């Protein structure tokens, strides 16, 4: 590493380089983070269930640890995430009888949560994924079904953004989602954000999760999505980048190690990805990987539980992979 290029420095004039972490991985991959990133995202500890597990009971300990680590190393922090159909406790949508609360009650709870969480980290966290994955990933419908939407109505997103803006008007507020480059979903996301923006809703950016594979999405699809979203006048952040060695249909579990072909194609894939990102440096301001080294990745258990994946730039021994060299040489 002594002579190894530093990711954040390599892209100093293009965009921040980040990593999703948790207190455990911060310790386990501490030096890698210190040497390469200038932005941090909580992989799970800033999600609803990990911040307010019970009404009125806030558990900021793990999140505080992540933020402290970031600030002590002059690293920016992205807040993930306020309103999502996943990892949100049941109490949020129920009353005493266990029945669903009303629209006004859920809005009160939403505002209180957003207000409390956002205010605590105001001045330390510069952006927030306010709404996460609201768009349907399948079907002809625009929106995915969720208790938030069901109880409040389709304007639940408008309210979420307004609440966050009030809590910290200096923060950049994002709509974050995956499969953001497949045409059908891209158009739904574009339509949604455009509609919010056309209503004066304070949404400042679109978060492209980029949970990609070696083949999907294509570079043309990525370029088209970047341009389509950028045309709305919003800032763009790649928020959870990883390049899986397995396509969606590939559910093998025997592979103890990636083939030379996989490693080679991944290197090419990452080089092409970053060449494209650099080309659009004017609209892309941050690129965060959902992790940093192959010794820790949510893809080891998703979508197939119990297997192993090698989706990042560094291997399990924290050594640069072929993908690292192509990525930093664009
Ligand atoms: O649960 C979500 C995953 O489904 C998502 O991964 C996508 C699954 O569908 C595939 O067709 C896509 O290629 C893949 O990106 O990642 C985000 C996670 O929250
Ligand atoms: O440890 C796991 C996390 O890595 C995972 O993070 C999700 C990745 O996919 C994105 O679509 C989501 O927004 C992001 O929260 O969540 C589950 C957790 O067990
Ligand atoms: Na930029």
Burial of 77 (0-12, 13-18, 19+ CB in 10 A): buried
Q: In the 3-class helix/strand/coil scheme, how is the chain assigned residue by residue?
A: CCCCCCHHHHCCCCCEEEEEECHHHHHHCHHHHHHHCCEEEECCCCCHHHHCCECCECCCHHHHHHHHHHHHCCCEEEEEEEEECCCCCHHHHECCCCCECCHHHHHHHHHHHHHHHHHHHCCCCCEEEEEECCECCCCCCCECCCHHHHHHCCCHHHHHHHHHHHHCCCCEEEEEECCCCCHHHHHHHHHHHHHHHCCCCCCCEEEECCEEECCCCCHHHHHHHHHHHHCCCCEEEEEEEEEECCCCCCCCCCCCCCCHHHHHHHHHHHHHHHHHHHHCCCCEEEEEECCCECCCCHHHCCCCCCCCCCCCCECCCCCECHHHHHHHCC
Closest-lying ligand to the alpha carbon of 81? 2
Ligand 1 near 178 CB (within 6 A) = yes
Q: Are 253 and 307 in contact (CB under 8 A)?
A: yes
Token reading at 108: 């009160």
Q: Which atom of ligand 2 is nearest to the CA of 47?
A: 15
* Whole-angstrom distance, CA of residue 162 vs CA of residue 173: 10
How many other C-beta atoms can be found within 10 angstroms of the C-beta atom of residue 257?
10
Atom index in ligand 2 nearest the CA of residue 297 equals 4
Q: What was the elucidation method?
A: X-ray
129 class by beta-carbon count within 10 Å (0-12 exposed, 13-18 middle, 19+ buried): buried
Tokens of 111: 């505002």
Rounded CA gap, 117 and 75, in Å?
19
Contact present, 19 and 289 (Cβ < 8 Å): yes
Q: Can you tell me the distance from the alpha carbon of 230 to that of 311, in angstroms, rounded to the nearest whole number?
A: 27
Q: Is the CB of 240 within 6 Å of ligand 2?
A: yes
Ligand 1 neighbourhood includes 36 CB (under 6 angstroms): no
Which residue reads 């005493």 in tokens?
A: 96
* Neighbouring C-beta atoms of residue 328, cutoff 10 Å: 20
| Resolution of the coordinates, Å | 1.8
Return the ligand 2 atom nearest residue 86 CA.
Answer: 15
Whole-number Å distance between alpha carbons of 206 and 127: 11
Is residue 44 within 6 Å of ligand 2 at its C-beta? yes
The C-alpha atoms of residue 276 and residue 40 are separated, in whole angstroms, by: 23
* CA-to-CA separations, 52 to 82, 87, 123, 157, 170, in angstroms, rounded: 11, 11, 21, 20, 24
Distance 273 CA to ligand 3 centre (A): 15
Residue among 274, 275, 253, 272 at smallest CA distance from 264? 272
326 C-beta closer than 6 A to ligand 1: no
Measure Cα distances from 290 to 67, 97, 151, 232, 239 in Å. Answer: 17, 39, 31, 26, 7
Q: What is the CA radius of gyration of the chain?
A: 19
Rounded to 5 degrees, what are φ and ψ at 267? -60, -45
Structural tokens at position 198: 């056309």
Domain 1-330 class in CATH:
alpha beta
Ligand 2: centre distance to CA 42 (Å) = 10
| Of 136, 177, 211, best ligand 1 pocket probe by most atoms within 8 Å of the beta carbon | 211
Q: Write out the two tokens for 206.
A: 């679109």
Give the residue among 129, 45, 125, 122 at the shortest CA–CA distance from 80. 129
Distance CA 186, CA 242 (A): 19
């Amino acid at each position: 590493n002594s002579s190894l290029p530093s990711l954040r420095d390599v892209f100093a004039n293009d965009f921040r380089i980040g990593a999703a972490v948790n207190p455990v991985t911060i310790e386990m991959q501490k030096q890698l983070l210190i040497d390469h990133v200038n932005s941090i995202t909580a992989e799970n500890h800033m999600k609803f269930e990990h911040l307010q597990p019970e009404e009125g009971k806030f558990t900021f300990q793990e999140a505080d640890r992540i933020v402290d680590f970031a600030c002590s190393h002059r690293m920016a922090v992205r807040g993930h995430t306020l309103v999502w159909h996943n990892q949100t406790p049941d109490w949020v949508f129920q009353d005493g009888q266990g029945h669903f609360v009303s629209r006004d009650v859920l809005l009160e709870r939403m505002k209180c949560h957003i207000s409390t969480v956002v205010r605590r980290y105001k001045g330390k966290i510069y952006c927030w994924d306010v709404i996460n994955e609201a768009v349907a990933d399948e079907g002809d419908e625009l929106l995915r079904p969720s208790k938030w939407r069901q109880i409040i109505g389709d304007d639940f997103m408008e309210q979420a953004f307004l609440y966050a803006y009030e809590a910290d008007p200096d923060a950049l507020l994002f709509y974050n989602d995956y499969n953001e480059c497949f045409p059908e979903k891209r158009e739904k996301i574009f339509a949604l954000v455009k509609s919010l923006r056309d209503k004066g809703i304070p949404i400042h950016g679109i978060g492209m999760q980029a949970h990609w594979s070696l083949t999907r999405p294509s570079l043309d699809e990525i370029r088209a999505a970047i341009e389509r979203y950028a045309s709305l006048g919003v800032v763009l952040h790649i928020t959870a980048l990883d390049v899986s060695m397995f396509e969606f249909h590939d559910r093998r579990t025997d592979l103890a190690a990636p083939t030379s072909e996989m490693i080679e194609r991944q290197a090419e894939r990452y080089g092409q990805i970053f060449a494209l990102f650099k080309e659009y440096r004017d609209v892309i301001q941050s690129v965060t990987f959902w992790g940093i080294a192959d010794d820790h990745t949510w893809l080891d258990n998703f979508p197939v539980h119990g297997r192993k994946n090698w989706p990042l730039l560094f291997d399990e021994q924290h050594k640069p992979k072929p993908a690292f060299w192509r990525a930093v040489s664009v």
